[PDB]
């Protein structure tokens, strides 16, 4: 109905974590347990389509990775830290329960005393929610520039999920609900959003829609050491929810699939992506994918994909870009960017 | 005569419903002190640091199996009754608690699923230590003002059971050091509780309190002062006090400019509930009459972000609030962050 008209994307950056763990290396470590429990499918490589993921140096915290992404994004926007009025952290990974990881990143950067900070959590949709929050403050004139940051760390989840499941007493069906933890990846991203009158040639964020099906909130449940997931059910219901969200997006954004130049989606696995593409009848050329080599980087995967698109020169002035997230909740958000 | 700007204050946003839940089991500072007494003896501690210095006589706890979502959900049902609306009217639900069931999904999604929100309802969590309920209120108010929703729930359930249990064990260790004992003591001032607020477009609830918003300042160079995980909170209460008050004084200069505030013109100050020295420092630093600052930490401890709406609900329930009262909401949270916002009853 009334879209955002003066919110721009002034800067955008991602960080690839530096250590590679391949699914071949994981599978060798788990072969005993694959054997002594009779499993013959390579679930990571063949079903999920995840061949590697990246991990940080030890003791990199979420705040550290978010800080590194933030600095890059500020250089991409060509602004100093003193112009930032809002810093929102959207990661699943968090240094503490308190304070917010946002305050830590904000302190590492040296934001001013006018800078407002807080964290948003919402599984793989939180970056888009963070963008939407920021847009609302930009539009109203509360701030000129915002940082939305997201660092994800899966190092501990790998150490405990693995070392767990390689021990003498390891059972099953457990296995199928925990191997999903072995699809997770490390990475970070950041974006600088701004009032359009400050950065007139920049991409524009128009906003979007959200629909929910919170009857299914038990399906995917993650802490520091463990993620237990029902992958089948998440997929199917996720897609039904997305179809409903797409009817809303038609109503508020004038969306039809044939007019969108890119779909930037949260990156989960080959079956999640194929089912999305097949259901909606989307040309797969419009859907870049990174999970083969990075796994599932949660809410950072959206901006990481967009930033990769930008750095490869795939995005042209006037491109209509759909940002979308299907996340645990279940929740679905779809938003537009005009490049 | 001279037209001024709104200073970015919210327009046409109201408070339609408000409620709190008190946790059921009382844990007295007398009981805690009896358990800490051999450690006190060994460290030479001769004063009642909980009851006499902090001013906390008791706090409440839930049962061990109560999650943040369960408590929030009970507060939310009460707030919806107070607003006289069904869950179907809610277009936004924000959970603001420090305590959380999981890292994902959001605790707001659990609450929402418990209450049966519709498929139009947007949900997510906000985390910002003791300021987050106000941050949630602001976020919802921006949506309400813009006309995107009619009603929002801001909810907050706090559970301190685990922190109590594990702190008391570490604090009674024969090998605990003075510095660790001092660093962890503040965790024994925490309390359990929950709150929830229904916010609405003012045209739907014409006689309801109005929420104006206000101003925020930060000092994120002090982000190490109070750090907490699921079973441990470490706090430098001396610099939190000093640097908190310094941040508050700065935020209050901004409030004078945007809200027109003067201490003499506010009917109540609703502050996050920390301890007697923090409250005495705040009141003396600003010259506030103590009668206008209701305190619940004496019997409930520090309930984090829920403290602000719990105090507001308890003022409401006591009949301390009258139409036209100018209520200052002031939060100084770990970070450091400070917000000062106005409600006109």
XYZ file of C-alpha atoms in Angstrom:
684
model
C 0.000 0.000 0.000
C 2.477 2.826 1.026
C 6.026 1.402 0.318
C 9.284 2.989 1.639
C 10.365 5.640 -0.932
C 13.465 7.291 0.703
C 15.403 4.286 2.132
C 18.557 3.271 0.433
C 21.286 0.626 0.704
C 24.452 2.709 0.919
C 26.976 -0.072 1.612
C 27.126 -3.841 1.821
C 29.872 -6.389 2.665
C 30.345 -10.061 3.659
C 33.186 -12.023 5.234
C 33.966 -15.621 4.289
C 35.350 -17.555 7.226
C 38.865 -18.888 6.522
C 38.964 -22.593 7.519
C 37.320 -25.246 5.295
C 35.831 -28.442 6.698
C 34.655 -30.700 3.856
C 31.760 -33.109 4.193
C 34.225 -35.900 2.970
C 36.347 -35.064 6.123
C 33.229 -35.093 8.320
C 32.068 -38.412 6.769
C 35.406 -40.167 7.441
C 35.208 -39.089 11.092
C 31.649 -40.422 11.254
C 32.216 -43.703 9.177
C 32.507 -46.092 12.259
C 29.198 -44.750 13.417
C 27.665 -44.831 9.897
C 28.943 -48.492 9.782
C 28.134 -49.727 13.352
C 24.643 -48.251 12.753
C 24.036 -49.383 9.162
C 23.534 -46.078 7.244
C 24.540 -46.055 3.572
C 23.373 -42.665 2.193
C 25.789 -39.664 2.283
C 23.261 -37.266 3.705
C 25.476 -34.159 3.647
C 26.942 -34.432 0.195
C 24.256 -36.346 -1.731
C 20.951 -35.392 -0.037
C 21.662 -31.879 1.364
C 24.135 -30.999 -1.359
C 26.581 -29.496 1.098
C 30.157 -30.310 0.204
C 31.978 -27.949 2.576
C 31.398 -25.246 5.109
C 33.735 -22.689 6.665
C 34.762 -22.165 10.276
C 36.441 -19.273 12.057
C 39.740 -19.262 13.969
C 39.146 -20.484 17.529
C 37.723 -17.912 19.932
C 36.383 -15.656 17.152
C 33.067 -14.548 18.694
C 30.019 -13.493 16.831
C 30.705 -9.914 17.793
C 34.192 -10.113 16.262
C 32.946 -11.387 12.910
C 30.103 -8.772 12.854
C 32.634 -6.086 13.651
C 34.839 -7.081 10.660
C 31.796 -7.119 8.316
C 30.651 -3.716 9.688
C 34.058 -2.102 8.898
C 33.930 -3.396 5.351
C 30.418 -2.161 4.840
C 31.300 1.331 6.128
C 34.230 1.448 3.626
C 31.786 0.306 0.893
C 29.469 3.189 1.801
C 32.329 5.589 2.173
C 31.151 6.855 5.586
C 32.780 7.117 8.995
C 31.420 5.422 12.125
C 30.391 8.861 13.459
C 27.467 9.028 10.951
C 25.792 5.819 12.287
C 22.717 6.461 14.444
C 21.455 2.849 14.684
C 23.308 -0.471 14.972
C 21.129 -3.613 14.957
C 22.661 -7.086 15.338
C 20.573 -9.843 13.827
C 22.602 -13.001 14.392
C 21.442 -16.310 15.900
C 24.905 -16.624 17.498
C 25.271 -14.252 20.403
C 28.179 -13.576 22.716
C 25.986 -13.389 25.900
C 22.399 -13.161 27.000
C 23.344 -9.706 28.091
C 24.412 -7.206 26.996
C 23.287 -7.267 23.353
C 25.890 -8.309 20.856
C 25.020 -5.063 19.154
C 26.530 -3.065 22.091
C 29.776 -5.051 21.800
C 30.123 -4.502 18.038
C 29.143 -0.828 18.662
C 31.872 -0.467 21.255
C 34.488 -2.190 19.065
C 33.602 0.331 16.300
C 33.506 3.443 18.524
C 29.959 4.623 17.693
C 28.835 7.950 19.030
C 26.662 8.588 22.106
C 23.626 9.235 19.785
C 23.856 5.727 18.401
C 20.941 3.456 19.337
C 21.737 -0.261 19.571
C 19.922 -3.572 20.130
C 19.699 -7.180 18.899
C 16.821 -8.798 16.906
C 16.494 -12.615 16.962
C 14.301 -14.443 14.520
C 16.186 -17.429 13.107
C 17.009 -17.016 9.355
C 14.740 -14.020 8.791
C 16.252 -11.662 11.310
C 18.431 -9.686 8.812
C 15.447 -8.734 6.769
C 13.590 -7.833 9.974
C 16.545 -5.741 10.947
C 16.463 -3.955 7.577
C 12.759 -3.289 7.979
C 13.225 -1.857 11.477
C 15.988 0.355 10.258
C 14.016 1.557 7.252
C 11.203 2.624 9.552
C 13.566 4.798 11.635
C 15.296 6.200 8.456
C 11.915 7.070 6.893
C 10.821 8.893 10.039
C 13.935 10.933 10.241
C 15.241 9.571 13.454
C 18.654 8.597 11.944
C 20.507 9.276 8.633
C 22.453 6.039 8.507
C 22.076 2.559 10.076
C 24.262 -0.541 10.319
C 22.627 -3.992 10.224
C 25.206 -6.586 11.161
C 25.253 -10.384 11.512
C 28.171 -12.701 12.515
C 27.551 -16.407 12.745
C 29.787 -18.917 14.486
C 29.252 -22.603 14.293
C 32.622 -23.771 15.718
C 31.168 -25.136 19.007
C 28.180 -26.775 17.397
C 30.690 -28.834 15.238
C 32.939 -29.729 18.184
C 30.084 -31.065 20.288
C 27.803 -32.433 17.724
C 30.655 -34.555 16.238
C 32.642 -35.626 19.315
C 29.184 -36.504 20.735
C 28.045 -38.687 17.889
C 31.502 -40.542 17.529
C 31.341 -41.978 21.128
C 30.652 -45.723 21.976
C 27.018 -45.202 23.093
C 25.693 -43.240 20.213
C 22.077 -44.228 19.357
C 19.843 -43.131 16.292
C 16.925 -41.029 14.927
C 18.808 -38.623 17.187
C 21.266 -38.827 14.263
C 18.766 -37.759 11.586
C 17.589 -34.808 13.780
C 21.258 -33.715 14.584
C 23.037 -34.182 11.287
C 21.230 -31.018 10.357
C 23.669 -29.276 12.738
C 26.425 -30.479 10.420
C 24.996 -28.332 7.615
C 25.652 -25.071 9.499
C 28.307 -22.592 8.419
C 30.341 -19.658 9.621
C 30.211 -16.217 7.923
C 29.248 -12.574 8.447
C 27.696 -9.652 6.757
C 26.807 -6.105 7.177
C 24.784 -3.368 5.452
C 24.698 0.391 5.759
C 21.205 1.801 5.113
C 20.620 5.533 4.587
C 18.155 8.225 3.755
C 17.941 8.482 0.012
C 18.510 12.118 -0.260
C 22.051 11.442 1.053
C 22.903 8.693 -1.425
C 20.622 9.196 -4.460
C 22.280 6.670 -6.836
C 22.119 3.773 -4.371
C 19.688 0.811 -4.383
C 16.303 1.442 -2.733
C 14.633 -0.774 -0.084
C 10.879 -0.752 -0.665
C 9.794 -2.976 2.220
C 7.738 -6.090 2.114
C 5.390 -8.507 3.851
C 5.445 -11.143 6.533
C 3.159 -14.179 7.142
C 3.395 -16.662 9.952
C 2.530 -20.183 10.976
C 3.678 -20.263 14.601
C 1.733 -23.492 15.292
C 5.030 -25.088 14.094
C 7.509 -23.312 16.475
C 8.832 -26.712 17.855
C 10.170 -27.938 14.459
C 13.746 -26.431 14.659
C 15.359 -25.745 18.023
C 18.935 -24.532 18.417
C 21.333 -23.727 21.304
C 25.193 -23.141 21.579
C 25.975 -26.932 21.245
C 22.877 -28.516 19.657
C 20.398 -28.053 16.863
C 17.529 -30.562 16.638
C 15.483 -30.179 13.439
C 12.551 -31.853 11.639
C 13.800 -31.118 8.128
C 10.979 -32.781 6.115
C 8.144 -30.989 7.792
C 9.860 -27.589 7.889
C 10.294 -27.871 4.049
C 6.750 -28.732 3.187
C 5.033 -26.276 5.529
C 7.659 -23.662 4.713
C 6.621 -23.764 1.123
C 2.905 -23.606 1.862
C 3.643 -20.601 4.019
C 5.710 -18.994 1.277
C 2.799 -19.394 -1.228
C 0.553 -17.574 1.136
C 3.217 -14.875 1.624
C 3.579 -14.552 -2.149
C -0.177 -13.767 -2.477
C 0.356 -11.013 0.114
C 3.413 -9.767 -1.742
C 1.324 -9.569 -4.947
C -1.128 -7.352 -3.068
C 1.404 -4.942 -1.471
C 4.375 -5.072 -3.915
C 2.785 -5.784 -7.376
C 4.878 -8.980 -7.488
C 4.730 -11.502 -10.267
C 7.686 -13.868 -10.646
C 8.302 -13.121 -14.209
C 9.148 -9.485 -13.373
C 11.755 -10.213 -10.668
C 15.364 -10.252 -11.783
C 16.759 -12.021 -8.664
C 15.492 -14.043 -5.720
C 17.899 -13.758 -2.831
C 16.836 -16.544 -0.441
C 18.050 -17.945 2.877
C 20.433 -20.816 2.049
C 19.560 -24.147 3.593
C 20.132 -27.115 1.171
C 19.631 -28.408 -2.327
C 16.094 -29.909 -1.581
C 14.958 -26.675 0.086
C 16.092 -24.633 -2.897
C 14.733 -27.069 -5.552
C 11.370 -27.286 -3.875
C 11.188 -23.447 -3.683
C 12.136 -23.074 -7.331
C 9.833 -25.861 -8.582
C 6.803 -24.690 -6.517
C 6.970 -21.106 -7.651
C 8.011 -21.890 -11.217
C 11.075 -19.658 -10.903
C 13.832 -19.672 -13.472
C 16.810 -21.179 -11.516
C 19.087 -18.629 -13.181
C 17.584 -16.020 -10.916
C 18.473 -17.845 -7.668
C 22.139 -17.775 -6.587
C 23.171 -20.513 -4.213
C 26.125 -20.785 -1.753
C 25.280 -23.687 0.600
C 27.316 -26.138 -1.525
C 30.489 -24.530 -0.195
C 29.380 -22.558 2.836
C 26.462 -24.538 4.305
C 23.635 -22.779 6.093
C 24.778 -19.404 7.592
C 21.298 -18.666 8.968
C 20.172 -15.003 8.799
C 23.472 -13.870 7.339
C 22.936 -15.943 4.166
C 20.570 -13.364 2.613
C 22.909 -10.431 2.793
C 25.926 -12.676 1.957
C 24.126 -13.674 -1.261
C 23.275 -10.099 -2.128
C 26.798 -8.979 -1.445
C 28.178 -11.768 -3.684
C 25.761 -10.734 -6.435
C 26.939 -7.120 -6.147
C 30.662 -8.006 -6.151
C 30.250 -10.296 -9.250
C 28.589 -7.433 -11.195
C 25.368 -9.349 -11.558
C 23.155 -6.518 -10.415
C 22.153 -3.635 -12.756
C 20.440 -0.339 -12.178
C 16.674 -1.017 -12.146
C 16.860 -4.698 -11.228
C 13.951 -5.823 -9.053
C 15.325 -8.030 -6.335
C 13.272 -10.203 -4.021
C 14.747 -10.838 -0.565
C 13.150 -13.770 1.059
C 13.388 -15.820 4.194
C 11.504 -19.005 5.342
C 12.611 -19.470 9.004
C 11.881 -21.455 12.186
C 8.767 -20.094 13.792
C 7.580 -20.803 11.129
C 7.765 -17.299 9.599
C 8.104 -16.108 5.979
C 9.181 -12.590 4.870
C 9.512 -11.214 1.376
C 10.832 -7.756 0.625
C 11.895 -5.748 -2.454
C 15.074 -3.947 -3.371
C 15.311 -1.869 -6.627
C 18.966 -1.776 -7.522
C 1.821 30.780 17.759
C 5.244 29.405 16.581
C 4.837 25.973 14.959
C 7.447 23.502 16.312
C 8.197 19.939 14.930
C 7.033 16.820 16.806
C 10.705 16.068 17.590
C 10.072 12.558 16.247
C 7.607 11.783 19.220
C 4.982 9.152 18.346
C 1.502 10.338 17.293
C -1.673 8.399 17.848
C -0.161 5.458 19.701
C -1.863 4.201 22.844
C -1.608 1.616 25.619
C -4.728 -0.567 25.407
C -3.812 -3.200 27.959
C -1.249 -3.888 30.617
C -0.630 -6.734 33.048
C 2.035 -8.388 35.190
C 2.489 -11.779 36.742
C 4.291 -12.236 40.093
C 6.301 -15.499 40.345
C 4.953 -17.748 43.148
C 7.850 -18.875 45.438
C 9.471 -16.396 47.787
C 13.184 -16.648 48.405
C 14.163 -14.372 51.324
C 17.560 -12.666 51.666
C 17.571 -14.138 55.242
C 17.594 -17.700 53.690
C 20.267 -16.776 51.173
C 22.406 -15.223 53.946
C 22.089 -18.335 56.079
C 23.397 -20.370 53.185
C 26.270 -17.836 52.477
C 27.231 -17.301 56.122
C 30.240 -19.631 56.190
C 31.534 -17.874 53.068
C 30.847 -14.445 54.609
C 32.789 -15.539 57.710
C 35.732 -16.699 55.708
C 35.797 -13.446 53.629
C 35.368 -11.175 56.724
C 32.036 -9.898 55.443
C 30.123 -8.439 58.401
C 27.308 -6.473 56.796
C 24.068 -7.809 55.201
C 24.965 -6.810 51.661
C 21.600 -7.980 50.276
C 19.138 -6.730 52.784
C 20.950 -3.705 54.308
C 23.137 -2.449 51.393
C 21.162 -3.478 48.270
C 17.768 -3.168 49.991
C 16.468 -6.499 48.665
C 14.538 -8.480 51.336
C 13.037 -11.128 49.038
C 12.622 -12.089 45.428
C 10.285 -14.491 43.648
C 11.099 -17.638 41.695
C 9.073 -19.924 39.394
C 9.273 -23.721 39.397
C 12.441 -25.144 37.698
C 10.397 -26.225 34.599
C 8.901 -22.739 33.794
C 10.384 -21.238 30.622
C 10.461 -17.593 29.572
C 7.724 -18.372 26.953
C 5.360 -19.840 29.584
C 5.583 -16.806 31.786
C 5.264 -14.349 28.882
C 2.286 -16.205 27.579
C 0.454 -15.937 30.936
C 1.154 -12.188 31.082
C -0.038 -11.810 27.492
C -3.415 -13.499 28.212
C -3.891 -11.076 31.090
C -2.995 -8.045 29.015
C -5.434 -9.147 26.232
C -8.212 -9.393 28.919
C -7.274 -5.945 30.236
C -7.510 -4.620 26.561
C -10.731 -6.560 26.058
C -9.573 -8.011 22.709
C -9.039 -11.450 21.247
C -5.668 -12.692 20.034
C -6.977 -12.347 16.459
C -6.619 -8.508 16.636
C -2.828 -8.679 17.177
C -0.743 -7.879 14.099
C 2.687 -7.698 15.846
C 4.080 -9.579 18.856
C 7.562 -8.697 20.250
C 9.262 -10.608 23.018
C 11.790 -8.471 24.868
C 13.146 -10.768 27.566
C 16.817 -11.434 28.530
C 15.832 -15.085 29.317
C 15.123 -17.124 26.249
C 13.897 -20.703 25.629
C 16.385 -21.250 22.703
C 18.805 -19.412 20.452
C 16.243 -20.265 17.712
C 13.320 -20.186 17.136
C 12.480 -16.795 18.696
C 10.723 -16.881 22.028
C 8.132 -14.602 20.449
C 7.267 -17.488 18.014
C 6.646 -19.858 21.028
C 4.470 -17.325 22.780
C 2.570 -16.670 19.554
C 2.026 -20.330 18.878
C 0.777 -20.695 22.533
C -1.701 -17.889 22.116
C -2.856 -18.939 18.606
C -2.023 -15.707 16.652
C -3.265 -15.361 13.156
C -1.116 -15.880 10.074
C -0.905 -12.069 9.570
C 0.940 -11.689 12.874
C 4.612 -10.627 12.630
C 6.804 -11.927 15.536
C 10.435 -11.573 16.595
C 12.524 -11.048 19.676
C 14.454 -7.941 20.747
C 17.401 -8.228 23.205
C 18.887 -5.185 24.932
C 19.314 -5.984 28.608
C 17.004 -3.884 30.924
C 15.951 -1.468 28.105
C 14.417 -3.945 25.729
C 10.713 -3.563 26.708
C 10.971 0.122 25.844
C 12.762 -0.755 22.608
C 9.867 -3.112 21.825
C 7.341 -0.468 22.625
C 9.148 1.929 20.182
C 9.252 -0.596 17.425
C 5.578 -1.394 17.789
C 4.699 2.322 18.072
C 6.401 3.047 14.683
C 4.175 0.482 13.027
C 1.014 1.637 14.832
C 1.699 5.326 13.931
C 2.180 4.400 10.311
C -1.154 2.545 10.259
C 0.284 -0.897 9.424
C -1.357 -2.709 12.323
C -4.143 -1.980 14.762
C -2.794 -3.750 17.860
C 0.582 -5.146 19.075
C 1.649 -7.266 22.058
C 5.018 -6.523 23.743
C 5.763 -9.401 26.124
C 8.452 -10.267 28.634
C 8.958 -13.386 30.835
C 12.054 -13.561 33.110
C 13.344 -16.767 34.754
C 16.349 -16.512 37.238
C 16.156 -20.003 38.748
C 19.218 -21.397 37.132
C 21.406 -18.384 37.839
C 20.376 -18.508 41.496
C 21.098 -22.154 41.845
C 24.560 -22.074 40.149
C 25.630 -18.770 41.714
C 24.812 -20.011 45.206
C 26.868 -23.113 44.578
C 29.895 -21.252 43.258
C 29.564 -18.609 46.016
C 29.631 -21.306 48.731
C 32.700 -23.060 47.333
C 35.619 -23.210 49.883
C 37.847 -21.897 47.172
C 35.772 -18.965 45.965
C 37.908 -15.773 45.786
C 36.817 -12.331 47.059
C 36.803 -10.939 43.585
C 34.657 -13.714 42.168
C 32.269 -13.433 45.146
C 31.985 -9.597 44.472
C 31.655 -10.123 40.706
C 28.733 -12.550 41.073
C 26.826 -11.033 44.028
C 24.530 -8.936 41.850
C 23.036 -12.115 40.437
C 21.543 -12.744 43.914
C 19.486 -9.529 43.423
C 17.595 -10.825 40.374
C 13.943 -11.840 40.363
C 11.440 -13.702 38.320
C 8.237 -12.162 36.906
C 6.492 -11.283 33.691
C 4.718 -8.490 31.943
C 2.825 -7.727 28.828
C 1.377 -4.696 27.058
C -1.162 -4.341 24.289
C -0.512 -1.198 22.255
C -3.000 0.269 19.808
C -3.782 3.050 17.361
C -5.296 5.794 19.525
C -8.415 6.100 17.324
C -9.400 2.565 18.526
C -8.970 3.350 22.237
C -9.676 7.041 22.618
C -9.587 7.226 26.402
C -6.479 5.003 26.852
C -3.030 6.224 27.936
C -0.868 7.702 25.191
C 2.748 6.644 24.450
C 4.974 9.465 23.107
C 8.352 7.821 22.962
C 11.312 9.958 23.768
C 15.145 10.019 23.452
C 18.019 7.492 23.633
C 21.684 7.913 24.492
C 24.449 5.378 24.619
C 27.852 4.635 26.142
C 28.791 1.330 24.463
C 32.389 1.722 25.484
C 31.093 0.283 28.829
C 29.677 -2.889 27.257
C 31.844 -5.146 29.537
C 30.440 -3.931 32.827
C 27.626 -6.529 33.152
C 27.856 -9.817 31.276
C 25.538 -12.771 31.701
C 24.847 -16.256 30.321
C 22.225 -18.845 31.318
C 23.817 -19.633 34.657
C 26.270 -16.793 35.467
C 26.187 -13.013 35.727
C 29.324 -10.998 36.393
C 28.811 -7.298 37.189
C 30.964 -4.272 38.129
C 28.297 -2.533 40.148
C 30.472 0.403 41.065
C 31.120 1.564 37.434
C 27.611 0.657 36.351
C 26.425 3.090 38.912
C 28.798 5.860 38.100
C 28.679 5.468 34.297
C 24.850 4.804 34.423
C 24.179 8.027 36.191
C 26.538 9.940 33.945
C 24.646 8.515 30.911
C 21.267 9.368 32.461
C 22.287 13.024 33.050
C 23.235 13.222 29.333
C 19.968 11.591 28.221
C 18.035 13.997 30.430
C 19.549 17.042 28.658
C 18.236 15.557 25.435
C 14.843 14.947 27.117
C 14.602 18.557 28.193
C 14.968 19.431 24.476
C 12.669 16.884 22.905
C 10.121 16.180 25.645
C 10.184 19.518 27.332
C 10.857 17.691 30.559
C 11.520 19.229 33.899
C 11.737 17.022 36.984
C 9.108 19.106 38.776
C 6.536 18.561 35.988
C 6.571 14.678 35.955
C 4.066 12.913 38.141
C 5.901 9.497 38.226
C 9.237 8.073 37.306
C 9.080 4.376 36.275
C 12.644 3.123 36.385
C 14.281 -0.281 35.871
C 14.563 -1.825 39.364
C 18.138 -2.429 40.413
C 18.847 -1.739 44.086
C 18.552 0.837 46.801
C 21.953 2.639 46.063
C 21.156 2.888 42.308
C 17.681 4.336 43.096
C 19.003 6.695 45.836
C 21.761 7.872 43.327
C 19.273 8.470 40.578
C 16.860 10.429 42.833
C 19.630 12.587 44.455
C 21.470 13.204 41.157
C 18.259 14.602 39.582
C 16.590 16.102 42.644
C 13.471 13.942 42.281
C 10.964 13.578 45.101
C 11.224 9.842 46.208
C 7.478 9.662 46.507
C 7.272 9.747 42.711
C 9.578 6.736 42.183
C 7.863 3.489 43.045
C 10.264 0.673 43.974
C 9.507 -3.070 43.951
C 13.019 -4.532 44.303
C 12.594 -4.804 48.107
C 10.231 -7.762 47.612
C 10.910 -8.775 43.992
C 14.469 -8.008 43.187
C 15.563 -6.892 39.718
C 13.370 -8.340 37.039
C 15.460 -6.868 34.147
C 13.449 -5.482 31.150
C 10.175 -6.566 32.665
C 10.765 -4.250 35.661
C 9.519 -1.160 33.762
C 6.117 -2.498 32.709
C 5.744 -4.469 36.006
C 6.107 -1.195 37.927
C 3.737 0.582 35.607
C 1.076 -2.231 36.042
C 1.544 -2.187 39.806
C 1.089 1.659 39.828
C -2.131 1.142 37.790
C -3.361 -1.580 40.076
C -2.714 0.617 43.220
C -4.720 3.511 41.718
C -1.618 5.783 41.818
C -2.261 6.919 38.220
C -4.872 9.448 37.005
C -5.825 10.770 33.590
C -3.452 13.492 32.520
C -0.524 12.184 34.662
C 2.843 12.619 32.946
C 4.804 9.414 33.439
C 8.539 9.218 32.734
C 9.796 5.721 31.717
C 13.529 5.611 32.241
C 15.725 2.708 31.519
C 19.489 2.481 32.024
C 20.572 -0.927 30.644
C 23.815 -2.915 30.255
C 25.477 -1.756 27.123
C 25.382 1.042 28.298
C 22.120 2.399 26.838
C 19.653 4.866 28.265
C 16.101 5.708 27.081
C 13.696 8.157 28.553
C 10.110 8.073 27.271
C 6.804 9.642 28.223
C 3.400 8.147 28.799
C 0.454 10.485 29.388
C -2.100 8.541 31.390
